[PDB]
Nucleic acid binder design. Structure first.
Lengths: 94, 272, 35, 62, 179
RNA sequence: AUGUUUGCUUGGAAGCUGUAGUCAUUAAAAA
RNA sequence: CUAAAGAUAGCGUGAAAGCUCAAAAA
RNA sequence: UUUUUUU
RNA sequence: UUUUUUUUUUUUUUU
């Protein structure tokens, strides 16, 4: 948080190609993925994320509130500006 | 000994067949009553929205204006009040139903058919009226977030309730991701087996997970936790523990005209 | 109750719904809007 | 007979920020009042739209 | 799991007398529910008396919940003050209850599904509606759908039996050919 | 209609001064 | 004649008796 | 110089 | 069911 006047240390980048688990199968003498088969849509959703520019808000986990609550009011009349992104960078194909 | 008994016993097999046949016939429509393999779609006609026409005019005329907007051009339609409200308010002593937003409307305009789902509804708080209803297209293969309602019809068969214990329905609706050509029907909570426990008793979504389509078209929200996401409770009245006020609580008595919080709420000396 | 003085006689046809010195006009509206 | 409406192949969704103009809004006096506010609108547009014929013409996304 | 959430606390701060804003949308609550029709002020004593009457009428086995809490403070001129000498001391607390807001509700679900011939019970709400300074209307929403109704099936069966009977009667006399 | 004035309070409590419970009738020359 | 009849909804008495209603039949 | 009550 | 309203200056309600 505090001010810094110096060149920041080198930060290693993160990959974009996660691993996968496979197991042998004698019924075809081949290695099959351990993940459960699903719809392409589901597969895509889980992997990348929601398809489209926008989506619906998240559902409620906790039980409802026994009394009314004005949850449709923002925290502040004037939200602060967005903060910069900080983290590992994507690795470009060589 | 009497002959009527004998006759009745002899005739019972025949009588059974009639009920069997009646239920079969009833079931035939799909080409039990509470089965998951039941469609819920509706088909209604519409009228075009004329140029230089206001909302008010249409409303006064006896119609509900609507528009259709995603995966296509913006289309304007008008649906009869007596036709729309009937679906909207499907209870004699109820308000806007949950099921209203969980269907597949096959609207017909001119020479075109649109398979849509209402998203946005503008209804009177007290009176039963519809001002404006928006629609969203549904295309096969695209993820569609839909809130499927739950039913607890089989409440009489509850040992807990029989014994005099209190039973509640926590979750009225469950979120799902529809990909298929049709929306799954309302879920049924089978409460026939719910015994009272000293601490508390509850039912989760893991039990109801078996009600989803076999083809895998529908799926619950990943955010949920089937191992801990309760849907129904069973406890004793006046035997609950004390808990503090939630941090995300907003007092409705300090809301501005604009929908903003009062200056007072930002003060140090502002409990809750 | 508010019934004696002349600032509470309703408008009749051809007055504009706001004659001189009226209070009930703004009282009823306010009442309905919230008391 | 009746037919099911189907969108054109290759179409995608796109959110237009700031706003969308028209004949009316073409006029300066008929412009938007808080000109720096955000007025997003979701519209379907072909990806090929974002292709200029001449190099001297470019498309600023922001 | 279930919890007994603590009620809010009154705010000991002088506030304006501004108007009551309207409601955003209709509030849906399972089971029986009582709501207002017009905006007005309600006092903590009024709400407490309504709660006591509801509890006495219903009994100790049923459960009830409150949806409105008294937090808005209001001042009053003490007896013995001049025209204008500043704001008066806090007098009482009221709750800004706009039209359509819910006051009380019983999540209890009618178990009697195959008995649509009987209207719901609103004796508890009747016992307190005269007390309230606002007009109230009873409400009871459930998960019951048209599709899942036995009335339709009964109707269908009656029709079928009628038809069958008619057919039989016509065929018996032999005034027309068969098949 | 009947077991049945079913039970505990109560000097006494029948369906009908309080409260708990709140189902039992059609069946053995049916195999 | 067949069918049906709440542990008991409204009267009544001193502890009782008695009547009526619901259900059933028509 | 009254209107309405589907099939 | 409608024409008839504070038409509450008087008569009149003649539909």
């Amino acid at each position: 948080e505090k001010p810094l006047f110096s060149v920041l240390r080198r930060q290693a980048r993160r990959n974009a190609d996660p691993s996968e688990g496979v197991a042998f199968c004698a019924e075809s003498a081949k290695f099959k993925s351990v993940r459960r088969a699903q719809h392409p849509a589901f597969e895509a959703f889980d992997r990348q994320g929601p398809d489209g520019p926008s989506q619906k808000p998240a559902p409620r986990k906790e039980p409802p509130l026994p009394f009314y609550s004005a949850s449709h009011v923002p925290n502040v009349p004037r939200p602060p500006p967005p903060q910069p992104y900080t983290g590992p960078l994507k690795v470009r194909e060589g | 000994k009497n002959f009527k008994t004998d006759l009745i016993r002899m005739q019972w097999p025949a009588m059974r067949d009639e009920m069997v046949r009646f239920f079969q016939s009833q079931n035939a429509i799909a080409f039990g009553v509470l089965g998951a393999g039941r469609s819920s779609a509706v088909d209604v006609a519409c009228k075009p929205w004329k140029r230089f026409v206001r909302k008010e005019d249409i409303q006064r005329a006896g119609y509900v204006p609507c528009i259709v907007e995603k995966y296509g051009i913006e289309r304007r339609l008008a649906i009869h009040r007596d036709t729309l409200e009937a679906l909207a308010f499907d209870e004699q002593h109820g308000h806007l139903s949950y099921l209203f937003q969980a269907r597949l409307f096959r609207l017909r305009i001119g020479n075109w058919i649109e398979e849509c789902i209402p998203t946005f509804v503008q209804a009177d708080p007290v009176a039963r009226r519809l001002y404006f209803v928006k629609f969203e297209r549904h295309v096969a293969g695209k993820i569609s977030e839909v809130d499927i309602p739950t039913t607890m019809v089989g409440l009489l068969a509850c040992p807990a309730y029989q014994r005099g214990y209190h039973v509640e329905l926590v979750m009225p609706t469950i979120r799902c991701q529809c990909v298929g050509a049709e929306i799954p029907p309302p879920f049924f909570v089978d409460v026939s087996r719910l015994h009272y426990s000293p601490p508390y008793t509850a039912i989760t979504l893991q039990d109801l997970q078996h009600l989803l389509p076999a083809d895998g078209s529908a799926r619950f929200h990943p955010s949920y936790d089937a191992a801990t996401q309760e849907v129904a409770w069973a406890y004793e009245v006046g035997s609950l523990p004390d808990a503090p006020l939630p941090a995300d609580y907003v007092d409705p008595n300090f809301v501005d005209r604009k929908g903003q919080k009062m200056d007072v709420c930002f003060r140090n000396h502002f409990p809750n | 109750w508010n019934r004696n003085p002349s600032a509470r006689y309703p408008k009749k046809g051809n007055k504009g719904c706001r004659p001189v010195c009226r209070a009930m006009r703004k009282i009823r509206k306010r009442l309905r809007t919230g008391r | 007979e009746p037919k099911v409406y189907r969108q054109r192949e290759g179409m995608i969704q796109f959110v237009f920020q700031w706003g969308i103009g028209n004949s009316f809004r073409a006029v300066s006096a008929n412009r938007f009042r808080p000109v720096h506010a955000a007025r997003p609108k979701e519209v379907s547009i072909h990806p090929s739209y974002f292709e200029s014929p001449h190099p001297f013409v470019i498309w600023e996304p922001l | 799991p279930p919890f007994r959430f603590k009620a809010p606390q009154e705010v000991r701060i002088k506030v304006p007398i501004g108007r009551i804003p309207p409601a955003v949308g209709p509030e849906i609550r399972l089971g029986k529910s009582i709501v207002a029709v017009a905006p007005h002020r309600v006092t903590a004593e009024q709400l407490e008396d309504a709660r006591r009457v509801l509890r006495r009428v219903l009994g100790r086995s049923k459960e009830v919940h409150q949806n409105v809490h008294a937090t808005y403070a209001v001042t009053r001129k003490p007896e013995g003050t001049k025209m204008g000498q500043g704001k008066g001391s806090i007098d009482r607390f009221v709750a800004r209850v706009p039209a359509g807001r819910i006051l009380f509700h019983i999540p209890q679900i009618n178990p009697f599904h195959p008995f649509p011939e009987v209207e719901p019970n609103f004796a508890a709400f009747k016992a307190i509606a005269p007390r309230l300074p606002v007009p109230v209307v009873f409400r009871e929403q459930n998960n019951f759908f048209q599709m899942h109704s036995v009335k339709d099936l009964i109707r269908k069966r009656q029709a079928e039996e009628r038809e069958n009977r008619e057919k039989t009667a016509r065929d018996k006399l032999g005034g027309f050919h068969t098949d």
